[PDB]
Amino acid sequence: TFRTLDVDSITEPVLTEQDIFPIRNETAEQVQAAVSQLIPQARSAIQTGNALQGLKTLLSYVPYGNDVQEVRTQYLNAFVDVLSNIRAADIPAFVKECSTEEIDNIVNFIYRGLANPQAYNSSVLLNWHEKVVEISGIGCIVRVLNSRPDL
Amino acid sequence: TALVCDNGSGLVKAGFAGDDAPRAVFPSIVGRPRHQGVMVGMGQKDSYVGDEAQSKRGILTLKYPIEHGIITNWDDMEKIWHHTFYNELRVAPEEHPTLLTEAPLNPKANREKMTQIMFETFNVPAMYVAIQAVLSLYASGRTTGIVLDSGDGVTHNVPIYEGYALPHAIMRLDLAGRDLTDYLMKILTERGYSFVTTAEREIVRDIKEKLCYVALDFENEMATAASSSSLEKSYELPDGQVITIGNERFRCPETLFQPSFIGMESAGIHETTYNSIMKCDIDIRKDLYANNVMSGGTTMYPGIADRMQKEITALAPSTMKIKIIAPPERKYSVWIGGSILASLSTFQQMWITKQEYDEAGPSIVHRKCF
Amino acid sequence: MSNTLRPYLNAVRSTLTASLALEEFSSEIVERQSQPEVEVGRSPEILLKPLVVSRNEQEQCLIESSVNSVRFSIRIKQVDEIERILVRKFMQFLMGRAESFFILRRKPVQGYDISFLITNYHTEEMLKHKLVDFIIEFMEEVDAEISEMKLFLNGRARLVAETYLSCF
Amino acid sequence: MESAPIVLDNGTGFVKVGYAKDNFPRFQFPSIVGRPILRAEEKTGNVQIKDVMVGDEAEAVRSLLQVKYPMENGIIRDFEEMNQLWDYTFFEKLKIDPRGRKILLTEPPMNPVANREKMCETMFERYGFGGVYVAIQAVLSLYAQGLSSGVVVDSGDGVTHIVPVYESVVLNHLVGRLDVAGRDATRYLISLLLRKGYAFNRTADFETVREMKEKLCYVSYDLELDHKLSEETTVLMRNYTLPDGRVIKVGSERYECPECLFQPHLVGSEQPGLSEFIFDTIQAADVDIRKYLYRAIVLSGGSSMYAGLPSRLEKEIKQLWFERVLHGDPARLPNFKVKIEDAPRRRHAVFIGGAVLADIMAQNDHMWVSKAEWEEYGVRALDKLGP
Amino acid sequence: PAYHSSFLSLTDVPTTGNIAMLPLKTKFRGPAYPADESQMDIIDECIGLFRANCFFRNFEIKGPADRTLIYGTLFISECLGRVNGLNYRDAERQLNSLALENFSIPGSGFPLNALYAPPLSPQDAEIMRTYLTQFRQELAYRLLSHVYATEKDHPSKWWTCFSKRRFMNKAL
Amino acid sequence: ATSQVLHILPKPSYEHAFNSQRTEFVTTTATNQVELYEQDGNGWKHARTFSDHDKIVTCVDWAPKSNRIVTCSQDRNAYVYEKRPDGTWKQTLVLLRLNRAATFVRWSPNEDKFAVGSGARVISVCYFEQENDWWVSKHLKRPLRSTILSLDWHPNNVLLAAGCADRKAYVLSAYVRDVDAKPEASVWGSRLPFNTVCAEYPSGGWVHAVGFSPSGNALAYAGHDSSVTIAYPSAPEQPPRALITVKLSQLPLRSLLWANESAIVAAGYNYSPILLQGNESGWAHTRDLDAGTSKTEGPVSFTALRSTFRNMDLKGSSQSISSLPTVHQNMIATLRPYAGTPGNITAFTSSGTDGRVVLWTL
C-alpha cells in the first residue's frame, strides 16, 4: 500500500557533497598526470634509501575526487610503501617538522590504509598513528573526521 | 528503601537502610503492671513497651522477651516488633523489606519463627537475616578481620578473610552486659546497697553504663582502690539518695576478662579472640591480628581497647603487630553495617521474597540466609 | 590482556575520543523530533566521514559519526568454528541486555559482531571518558573471555567422556 | 470579567471557557467529575474531599476520587454529571450569575439531535441564559486562522472531524467523523503498556496515561525507520515517573500509540486514518475547488499536537496523490502543492475561533436562540442554527 | 463491588458533620432515634456486612449512611482486635470500656479526616460525640452476641480471625 | 586568569544569561523548563521556572538595558518574558513561522529586535509593533542551506553573522525599516537592504560560533574541525584583506568571544577556554585560561563506608572515579561577557553540559 512509496527523493532534492565541499578544479587527466610524475620520485627515494625525502615529496600533492579511484589507489600504494620503509626512530624527527597541513595529509591517508588490511600492513600504520597523534595532538584526527569524503 | 531492624537482646536498634545511624533505639523490654489498678479510666494499658515501659517501671514487672540472643517469649517479641514498626518508625511494615539480624550458633527454630512472624504477622514484602558479626565488619570499612561483637546477652567472634568467613573458627560466649548487670547487683550488695526487682536492675544498668571502666592491670588497680580515694565516686538515685562506689567500678567489667567471677568455666574475651585466630588457617592469622574489630555496647567501657590490645599482645607471638579497631560509634556498628548491606545493589537479589516464602514455607531461610 | 592490541587500541581510543564530540540536534526532515542522525542518514551535511581502524582482516572497528550521535561497530577474532559459535552467541547475550548497557545496539550493523550507539544524551548524562574506557576495556578482555569459554567447553567434554566411559 | 457573550468549548477531554474577544481560554480544565472513594492508597489531612469534586479540583486530587467522564465521542453520556461541570464552570471558575447572559456553545458535525436539544434546554432551564448559539466545532477553528477556505480537520479527545470550506460556503455533504481521537490513543496506550505488564485500570489512572501520552508520544515520519530504531537500538527508550513515584520504561509505545490516528485498525475501527480520510474528503469535492483545499489543509484541536503529525500528514498526502491520481508516475509530483497549516495556538483553535465568532454576532440579538423563543417553540427554536 | 448500606436510599434522616444519625435499637443513653425492634437497623447491617466488606480494597461512598457504615466497619475491627482469649463476662466489660474511652471525632487524630466533614459548630461536636459513643457501645454489645454465639467462654474463631483484617487498610 | 565556580546546576546548561545587574541569571536545563537563579549572599538560589514551551529549550538570552528574556525551543516557538510591576514575568508567544526547530537566539545591541536561527534553512529576525502589540518575524533565507548553529550581531544594529552547518559563516543584513536608523557606510557595505549578503566565508567543519570584533571591522568564527578563523573584509564584491585560520591541536571550539580588538577567548569540547591573540598580519593560540592545562589518615565518614562498598558492588573496585583536571567535566556550551567596558572584556562566564556555571577573570 501507499505508506512505503518515497516522495521526499522526488519533491525535496537534498544537498550533495559537492554543495558542502567545493568541486575539484583540476581535470581527471590533469591529476592523473600530476600523480604519475610523483610516484616514480617516491619509488626512487626507497631505492636510494632516503625514504623520508620520498614521503616529503610524495606528500607535496594529494589526489581527490570520485572520478579518480584508479589513481587514488596508486597514490595510497606508494604512500603505504613509503611508510613501511621509514625507520621507527626517524618518525619523531619527521613529524615534529611537518606543517599542520602535511600532518592532516599523513593521518588522512593512514585512515585509508587502515580501511584495506587485505592489501596493506596495518602494524606500521598503527605505529605511525600513535606517533603522529602523540606529537601533534588529538585535533589532527578531528580534521580527518571533518575532511572531504572523496579524499 | 528497606528497614534495618537489629532486635538485640538489650536494645532494639531500628531505622532505614542508607540512613546515617539508628533512629529508633529503645529497651528490648515489655513491662506489665504488678499493682491494684484502682483509678477507673486514666488511660491505663495492659502492657507497655520500650521507653514507655522504662519510664513507668516503678509499677511494672519489666521482662525482656529475648535472652542470650534467643527469643524466649514470642507473644511479647511480636509486641516489640509491632511497637518498632507502628509506634517508633511509624511505617507500614507491609511496604518495606526488613533486614533482621541474629548471633551465630543460634537454634534453627529461632531463625524460622523470626521469618514466619515477619511474613505471616507483619506481612513484610521481603526479608533477610544477617549474622551480626558479619554486619559489624561492613561498618568497619573492611573485608577481613575478627569481629568481637558483645551486646546485652551474647559475645561472639567471627573471623573473616577476603570476605570468606571461617565458620569452624566462630566462637560464641553466652556472657555480656546483662551478666555484668547481674554481677554488679551481686557486688553492690557487699557495700551496703540492695537492688532486687526488675526495675532496680535498670538503675544498676544505668550505674554500669557511666561509673564503670576497664582496668589496664586489674591486680594493681585492686591495690590502688584499696589504698586511695581517687578511684571512688558517686551516683544519685531516683529517690534522690547517693550511692558511692570504688573497686566495684572495675571488678564489674573484669568479668569479661575473667568469667570465673560469675561461676563460668571459660576463656575471657581476650583468650576467646586468640582461640578463634588460632583456629584459622596459618596464612590468614597476621591479617586477623591487625584487624580485631570491637562492636556492640558491652565494648564501650573506658580503657577496654587498651586492655584488649594488652592481653592479646601477651597471647600472640611478639614478632607481629596487634591492632584493636574500636570506633566511637561501635555502640551501633551492627545496625550501621546492616544499613550499608541493605543498600548494596547485589543485596536486592538476596532477600527472601513474599512469593518465595508462600511457596517454600519457613525453612527457606536455612537455604538462603547462610 | 593488552600488549599485542596496544597499537590498535591507542588508535581506536584516539579515534573514538575525537569522534565523541556530540551535541543536541533537532531533525531537519521532521518537526519537533530529535533523531540520532548517524542511524537515519537522511541529511548528509551533519554526517562525518566513516573511519575504519584495523589490526588484521578479521579484527576491525568501523566508526561512524554525526552532530548528535556516534555508531561504533567491531569485528572480533574468530579463528575457528568454536570461536564463531561462542562469539556469535556471547554477543546475543550482551546485546540482549542493551536496555541496561545504555550505549549498545540490539542488533549489529551488517557484517560486524557487536555495535554501539553513543547518542548525545549519553554524553550529557554519563561520563564520556568512562564510555571510551568501557569500549576499550571490552575490546581488550573479550578475547580472554571467549578463549576461557572454549576451555570450559573442553572441561565438560571431558566430564561427560569420563562419566560415560568409567561405568563399563 | 466582561459584559460581552460568554463562550464555552465543552470538549470531551477539556472544558475551555471565557468571553468574546478573548485571545486564549480564560480557563481550561479536564471535563471530569469525581465522587469520594477509599482504595488501599495514601490519605491526607492536606485536602478535604466534598461529595462532588470536578475539573481542576478533581484532577489535582484524583488519587482520592472515582473519576468519571460526562462525555464520550463528543456526546454527553450522563447529564447529571455534565450539570456538575456546568455548575462549576459558571459558579466557581467564571463566578457568574447566568440570568439573561448570552453564551456560545460548540458541538461536532454529526451528533445526535437529542444532544443539542438537551444541552440548549439545560442552558435555558438550569442556568437561564438569555441567548444561546451552537457552532460546528471545526468551522470555529477557521475563524481563528482569519481564513475563509481550505479544509479544516479538528482532532480532540473525543472525536476527529473534518469540514471542507470554499469561499466562506461550508460543504455540508463532505463533513465527516473519524471516531478515533486523543482518548482512543489513550485507551490504546493502556493496552500497549499492558503487554509490558504495567496496569492502569483504575478510573483515576486514566489522567496519568493522558499526561504520559501528552508528554512522550510522537508520530513516526517513516514507519520502517522508527521500527528500525525500535527493534535495532535502545535510543527510543524513555523513563516516565507516575504521580505514585513508580518509574515505567516506554519505547516502541511512543510512536506505535498515536499511529492509530493514521491506522484506526490498531484500535479495532475499520475507518481510514487522517491521511486517507482527508484525501477521500478533498477528492470528493468538485473539480474546481480541490486545488484550494490541498493548498490550505488546517489542523486543529489537542490531538493534532503530536510531534511529527504535520510532517507525517503532508508526506502521507503527497504519497497518496502519487498512488491514487498519478498511479506511481513521478513526472507530475512536483506540481502537487499541498500545504498543512499547523499554527502554535491550534490546540485552542475551536475556543479562539468561538471567541472571534461571539464578537462578530454579539449585538445581533436575533442571531441567537433567545430564552423567550425557546420557551414558546421548544426544541423547534433550534432550527435557527442552520441545516 | 463491595456492599454499600441499605440506608443510603433513605432521605431526610438527621445528620452531624456528614454522619447519618440513623435509627437505632438499643438500651444505651444517647441521641439516636428508636428503630422498629422487628427491623435491621444500621448495626445489624454493619455486623452482617463487616465480614464481607473487610476483604474488598476499593469502596466508593454514596452518602452519609455509608460514612456511618464505614465508622461501624472500622470499629468492628477494633473490637475483634480487643476480644482475643476473653470470657464473655470479661469481653462485655472490656469492649464497653473500649466503646466509652476518649476518641477523636471526624474534624479532630481521626484517620479518614479527608472524607468526613468536620462538625458544623461547637455544639455539633457534642451531638456527634454523644451519637458515636451510643452507636459504638451498642455496636460492641451487638457484636459480642455473634462472636460468643455457640459457647460463652471462648470467642468463636470464625469471628476472631478478622482481627488481622483491616477495612481498605484503614483503622481508628 | 582565575576560575570561580558560581553554581552547579542539576541538569545540562547549553545556554544562560546574567541580567545587567549581574544579580540573577536565566538558564536552559535540557527539558522544556527554563530556570531563573538569584544571588543568596555568596551562593545562588533557584527563584522560579518558566515552562511555556512544549519541547526542549535550545537557547535563551536576556536584554541588558530593557530587561526582557527571550527563549527558543525545539517546539518552534519563541517567548519573550517581561517583568510585571508585582515582580512576576509576563510570557508572550512570538509567531516565528518556522517549519522546524528554533536553535539559537540573540537580542540586537539596541534590543529593539532579536534574531532566531532554525533547522528550517532560515533565520527569523523578530521586532515589536506598538500599532498591534504583536511581535512579527522577517525570514532571512536566500543563502542559508542548512541548520543555523549560532548568531552574532554587529555592534551597529543592522548586520548579522550566522554560522551554518553547510560548513560556512554568513554575514547578512538584518536591516528592518521603521525600527532601525540608516546603517553607516562601513567595511561590510553601504547598499544594505534586508538579506543582502556581505560574505559567505568557508570553513573545514560546521561553524559552531561567530562574533564581530568590538570595532566591527573583522569577524571571527570557529569550526567543528577544531580551527578558529578571523576574516578581515575589504569592501563589497571584493576579497578580504586576510582570512587567517589558526588550527588548534585540541577538540573543537563551540563558543567564541573577542576579549578586545586583538585577543579572543574560545571554548568547547576541549573542556577549557583558550586565549588567541593577533591582528590582520597573523593570529596564534597563546594561553589556556584553565590551570588544568598543566593537568594539576584520619576518621572515615558513613557516606565513605557506604560508597566504598557500593563502588565494590556496582563498579570494579573501591577506588573513586577521577575528576578531569579542567574546571568543567563536560563540553562547555556557551561563553559570555560579564565585566569591563564594551570591547575590553575583563571577565567572562561559561556554562557547561556538566551544569557548571563559571566566572573567568582574565
Ligand SMILES: Nc1ncnc2c1ncn2[C@@H]1O[C@H](COP(=O)(O)OP(=O)(O)OP(=O)(O)O)[C@@H](O)[C@H]1O
Ligand atoms: N501535545 C500533545 N500531544 C499529544 N496529545 C495532546 C497534546 N496536547 C493535547 N493532546 C490531547 O488532546 C486532547 C484534548 O484536546 P481538546 O481540548 O482539543 O479535546 P476536546 O476539545 O476536549 O475533545 P473534543 O473536541 O473531541 O470534544 C487530550 O487527549 C490530550 O491528551
Ligand SMILES: Nc1ncnc2c1ncn2[C@@H]1O[C@H](COP(=O)(O)OP(=O)(O)O)[C@@H](O)[C@H]1O
Ligand atoms: N557506655 C557503656 N558502658 C558500658 N556498657 C554499655 C555502655 N553503653 C551500652 N552498654 C551496655 O550495652 C548493652 C547493650 O548493647 P547492644 O549492643 O545494643 O546489645 P544488644 O545488641 O544485644 O541489644 C547493655 O548491657 C548496656 O548497658
Ligand code: BEF
Ligand atoms: F543481643 Be545482644 F546482641 F547481646
Ligand SMILES: [Mg+2]
Ligand atoms: Mg547485639
Ligand SMILES: [Mg+2]
Ligand atoms: Mg474539541
